[PDB]
Amino acid sequence: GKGKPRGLNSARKLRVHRRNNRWAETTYKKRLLGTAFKSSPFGGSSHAKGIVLEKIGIESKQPNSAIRKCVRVQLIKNGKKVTAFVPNDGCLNFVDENDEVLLAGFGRKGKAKGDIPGVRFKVVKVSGVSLLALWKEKKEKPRS
Amino acid sequence: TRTSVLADALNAINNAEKTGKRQVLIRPSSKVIIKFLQVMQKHGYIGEFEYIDDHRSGKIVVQLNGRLNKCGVISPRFNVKIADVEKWTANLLPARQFGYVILTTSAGIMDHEEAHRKHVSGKILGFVY
Amino acid sequence: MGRMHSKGKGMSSSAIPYSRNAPAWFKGSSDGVVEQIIKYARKGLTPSQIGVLLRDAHGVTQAKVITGNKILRILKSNGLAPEIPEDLYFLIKKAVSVRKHLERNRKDKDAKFRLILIESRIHRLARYYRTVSVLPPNWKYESATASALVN
Amino acid sequence: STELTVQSERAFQKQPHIFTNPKAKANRKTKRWYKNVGLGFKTPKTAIEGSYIDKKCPFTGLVSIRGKILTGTVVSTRMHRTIVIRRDYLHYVPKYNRYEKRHKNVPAHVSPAFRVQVGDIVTVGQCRPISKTVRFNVLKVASATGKANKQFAKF
RNA sequence: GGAUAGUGGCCUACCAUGGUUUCAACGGGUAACGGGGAAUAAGGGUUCGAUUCCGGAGAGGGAGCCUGAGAAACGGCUACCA
RNA sequence: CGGUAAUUCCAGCUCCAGUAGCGUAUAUUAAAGUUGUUGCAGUUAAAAAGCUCGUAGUUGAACUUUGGGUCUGGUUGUCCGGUCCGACUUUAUGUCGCGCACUGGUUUUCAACCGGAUCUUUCCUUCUGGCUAACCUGUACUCCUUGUGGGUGCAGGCGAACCAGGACUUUUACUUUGAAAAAAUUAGAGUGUUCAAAGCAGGCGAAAGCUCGAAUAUAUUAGCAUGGAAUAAUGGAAUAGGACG
RNA sequence: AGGGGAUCGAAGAUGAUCAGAUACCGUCGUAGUCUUAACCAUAAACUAUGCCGACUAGGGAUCGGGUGGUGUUUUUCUUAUGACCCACUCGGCACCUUACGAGAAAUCAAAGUCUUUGGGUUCUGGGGGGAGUAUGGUCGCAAGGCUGAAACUUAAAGGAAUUG
RNA sequence: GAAUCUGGUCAAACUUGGUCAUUUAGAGGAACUAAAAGUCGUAACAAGGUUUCCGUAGGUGAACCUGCGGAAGGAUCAUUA
RNA sequence: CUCUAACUAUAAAAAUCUCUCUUCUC
Ligand SMILES: [Mg+2]
Ligand SMILES: [Mg+2]
Ligand SMILES: [Mg+2]
Ligand SMILES: [Mg+2]
Ligand SMILES: [Mg+2]
Ligand SMILES: [Mg+2]
Ligand SMILES: [Mg+2]
Ligand SMILES: [Mg+2]
Ligand SMILES: [Mg+2]
Ligand SMILES: [Mg+2]
Ligand SMILES: [Mg+2]
Ligand SMILES: [Mg+2]
Ligand SMILES: [Mg+2]
Ligand SMILES: [Mg+2]
Ligand SMILES: [Mg+2]
Ligand SMILES: [Mg+2]
Ligand SMILES: [Mg+2]
Ligand SMILES: [Mg+2]
Ligand SMILES: [Mg+2]
Ligand SMILES: [Mg+2]
Ligand SMILES: [Mg+2]
Ligand SMILES: [Mg+2]
Ligand SMILES: [Mg+2]
Ligand SMILES: [Mg+2]
Ligand SMILES: [Mg+2]
Ligand SMILES: [Mg+2]
Ligand SMILES: [Mg+2]
Ligand SMILES: [Mg+2]
Ligand SMILES: [Mg+2]
Ligand SMILES: [Mg+2]
Ligand SMILES: [Mg+2]
Ligand SMILES: [Mg+2]
Ligand SMILES: [Mg+2]
Ligand SMILES: [Mg+2]
Ligand SMILES: [Mg+2]
Ligand SMILES: [Mg+2]
Ligand SMILES: [Mg+2]
């Protein structure tokens, strides 16, 4: 019963067999293969500075209709291109395209949160200053 | 094929106890079962039991008194330190007020408390309570 | 109930009695048993045949009970032991018989399968005997020295 | 071993720094020096009466035994004057409270004083290094045959 | 036999054909210096360890070397490459 | 949630949670009995090779000294011995209290609870000398109320009470003990750093110098030494080439 | 590849039905269907239950063997067989009843003896898609088989039962 | 006792080739995901209106259909009326 | 407290479907 070996001298397989089944957990596979280092433009980085190109509106899914004000950006650290979201009401018109913007994660471990298809990342800092600082009227964009 | 006759013995004991019987026929009847049952009996889970010669491996028939609740064998006889005894007692026995982990010692077959007072420890066999 | 090569679980066998010593009514002499054993061996009958014949014809229950020793050991002490143990020799005989049948008629495939089973058993038994060192460690069973040992 | 006339190769194998005087009026065999290696091990008689040289012989040569003592089984004999000993052992993996069969292969150097066959169990001793891999000399073949004692059966 | 401070295919000459491996050798990757340890916690474990201590390695990359008990040194030299 | 009464957006007012901290993001740990050795599922939810043989691996029947008898070392609770604790109060005796707050025999049984030596057709490597440690010595003989309570005492001969040399050592795995496993970290003793994180200090004289320290455990793997003999393996004597003389 | 060539029928040819029907119905008809040696090795190759063990509850029949009948007809007067009837027992496909065990249930006499968690053992799975796809091997003439991902995309897919 | 110089020796480098590894364009092609109010049909879930499903082979705009063997997850646990 | 007998006989065609899914506390 319980079709795994139980003898004293079977240790080997009990290790190596586990060493096989660990390849089922996606977390473990990503960690050993380093897929976070080839794909997923953040090379393990929680934040990256990119240059914004153009401001886009992205539709939403079935139960929710609204134009999410997303934004394209090419990342300095690798040159790849991604799409991010502007995480407050009146902040798209803070971007001022061709601007240094600092991108962070987006709350679902490299996935798409909620009803915004084809995006993976928030936006935190624009022109050095943090976006939430602008939206709270605590600091002002340099406009340089 | 049969591998550890002690496991078969205790499995028959548990099966026949749960059904409420009073006697059990242990078939292979090796030394270790005999010592196990003397330990059992001196603790009291079992009454006056019996061995039978067969010119081959003999047999046991054991009387019960319903005093027992469950027995069992830890078939891969693990090497236990004198320290790791408390680990097995916690993981197997219901509550330390009673219960007995049965292990083979340099002295011989022996329950855990005897092992701790004799300050010896060997390989674990089973658990009864 | 093992029956390595067939899921059959039977237990057809014999339960020899509890009395290790001879039956009280036996009148034959243990020695005379020994001489008839050796003469039947001279006739060439294998120790299984020896035992069955001594059980059928005479009060010989188990030669171990009567003479205090077993038939193959009597033969070995008397120097009539065969070079190949009887069970093994029967395995070779069966295997070569099946081989002859198979080569005679090709398309029979269950014959081939049973031949594979028999070769598995014979390799297994030869391994055992080599470990106990009855056979020479170089004793090998394939096809042609097989046929020679058939002779 | 060195196998039939140790005086074989292009140079002479003299037991180092020992002199047998031709001038001696006895014509004795030779001054075949040796020593008791210690550790309660008896030198074999063939070590004294032998005719080999084996600078690396722990019993007649220059090498000395100290340190570790191992007990293994001969697994390979094919190389000259030297042996390969298998050591099987157990390794306790703690994550499963279990044991793991493992084996190492230790080379060693056998004096001609010793006869070794595959399957023998050998008490071997650590020594001053001999070669790239050899760091041991054989000191006692415990089972010369063991189960190969008997070779026939004639009651 | 040479060379070493000294054992050693360490190297040379002449021999032999051996050595390891499904008990995972060899090869490939490591965003791996190893370790004392850190986080984590019924018990059993999982992950991390660049770094306060211990060893090892390196002073752009490789090689070569004088002095000196001690270096193949680099805030010491020689040469090539960048 | 939001499509005209939005407890979900955006504000105001209240209120919640944490607080000189709180909020994110990517990792990782517990949750996760969703990596399962303890501790997973495999009829249909993912999953049992189409079936069989088979090397390596894994695991593999039962049985070979168990009972008894004694003496005896202790460790526990007995009866408690002396010391004396309380109601009893400013202070002492008695009385009466937990039936003894600390020192004591434990054959009054007792019960364990580990031992040790022993006899059972029952060896504990056993010799080779030591050394005899020890008296079976018994010799000169009793020194002592007559009584072996106890002595000056040396040839056979008591060997584990101890040495120290060869003979052999079946081998292990296992287990207990010990030695080892740097410090720092962890643990944890002591210590009014004003408490604490910490630190390894400090404390005490009457300040006239007199002292307490800087406690301990763990590391599990490999190696070393050591007591054990159930479990598990291996080993003998079968051609006798077997043991002792 | 060689031999056969009845039937039946992928392909094709047809006549219907329909909006279309080169599909289902209807007729003919090639390769195959059958063989002889060699490849192919996949099937819902399903009992969707791996193998070897021990135990645990009641009932019947059934298949193979062997047991005992003062048994029946057998019939050869009578014994012998055979065939039956009974009480068995060992093994096999299974079945019925039940839960006092399990399961999430459907159900299972094993899918029980599993939190009161350890008989011995192999091989598989870790949300669904991507996908048995990409690629490299490897076997095969070919068809293809074994081996075998990832990027990426989603809050479900799925199981059993309940009521409509 | 210098420059210089014979031999080797360690040999970093250099040239041309070969080799493999990784980044890297890459005309074009085949995809796949999300995108739900395009278009052609309606195979599947009921006997899905030809029972489904599997392997294999063929053809077809598409789902598919057909053949040969299977299976019930079938719509039958059942004829010893 | 004795038993095992009945039985029939159909199928032509029917494709598709735009929203809107909303609490249970005494
Ligand atoms: Mg590391
Ligand atoms: Mg580190
Ligand atoms: Mg350092
Ligand atoms: Mg350096
Ligand atoms: Mg630099
Ligand atoms: Mg100096
Ligand atoms: Mg340097
Ligand atoms: Mg420096
Ligand atoms: Mg300089
Ligand atoms: Mg409102
Ligand atoms: Mg608000
Ligand atoms: Mg937990
Ligand atoms: Mg699970
Ligand atoms: Mg399904
Ligand atoms: Mg499924
Ligand atoms: Mg299957
Ligand atoms: Mg199957
Ligand atoms: Mg095997
Ligand atoms: Mg056993
Ligand atoms: Mg430390
Ligand atoms: Mg601390
Ligand atoms: Mg038509
Ligand atoms: Mg057609
Ligand atoms: Mg047709
Ligand atoms: Mg036709
Ligand atoms: Mg398949
Ligand atoms: Mg998946
Ligand atoms: Mg797929
Ligand atoms: Mg491919
Ligand atoms: Mg359903
Ligand atoms: Mg020069
Ligand atoms: Mg339809
Ligand atoms: Mg249909
Ligand atoms: Mg129709
Ligand atoms: Mg239709
Ligand atoms: Mg259905
Ligand atoms: Mg339409």
UniProtKB/TrEMBL annotation, chain A:
CDD domains per record: Ribosomal_S23
One GO process term, biological-process aspect: translation
GO function terms (MF aspect): structural constituent of ribosome
Thylakoid is among the record's keywords: no
Keyword Ribosomal protein attributed: yes
GO cellular component: small ribosomal subunit
UniProt entry keywords in alphabetical sequence: Hydroxylation, Ribonucleoprotein, Ribosomal protein
UniProt xrefs under Pfam families: Ribosom_S12_S23
InterPro entries membership: NA-bd_OB-fold, Ribosomal_uS12, Ribosomal_uS12_euk/arc
Similarity annotation: Belongs to the universal ribosomal protein uS12 family.
UniProt protein name: KLLA0B11231p
Automatic annotation (TrEMBL), chain C:
Record has Ribosomal protein as a keyword: yes
Gene Ontology cellular-component terms listed: cytosolic small ribosomal subunit; nucleolus
Membrane spanning stretches: none
Keywords: Ribonucleoprotein, Ribosomal protein
GO biological process, one term: translation
UniProt family annotation: Belongs to the universal ribosomal protein uS15 family.
Name of protein: KLLA0F18040p
Organism annotation: Kluyveromyces lactis (strain ATCC 8585 / CBS 2359 / DSM 70799 / NBRC 1267 / NRRL Y-1140 / WM37)
TrEMBL record, chain D:
GO biological process entries: maturation of SSU-rRNA from tricistronic rRNA transcript (SSU-rRNA, 5.8S rRNA, LSU-rRNA); ribosomal small subunit assembly; translation
NCBIfam families (UniProt xref): PRK08572.1, uS17_arch
All copies of domain Small ribosomal subunit protein uS17 N-terminal, residue ranges: 7-70
A GO molecular-function annotation: structural constituent of ribosome
InterPro entries from the UniProt entry: NA-bd_OB-fold (IPR012340), Ribosomal_uS17 (IPR000266), Ribosomal_uS17_arc/euk (IPR028333), Ribosomal_uS17_CS (IPR019979), Ribosomal_uS17_N (IPR032440)
Record's keyword terms, sorted: Ribonucleoprotein, Ribosomal protein, RNA-binding, rRNA-binding
GO CC annotations on file: cytosolic small ribosomal subunit
Protein's recorded name: RP41
Lineage: superkingdom: Eukaryota
Protein family (similarity comment): Belongs to the universal ribosomal protein uS17 family.
Organism taxonomic ancestry: Eukaryota, Fungi, Dikarya, Ascomycota, Saccharomycotina
SUPFAM superfamilies registered for this protein in UniProt: Nucleic acid-binding proteins (SSF50249)
Chloroplast recorded as keyword: no
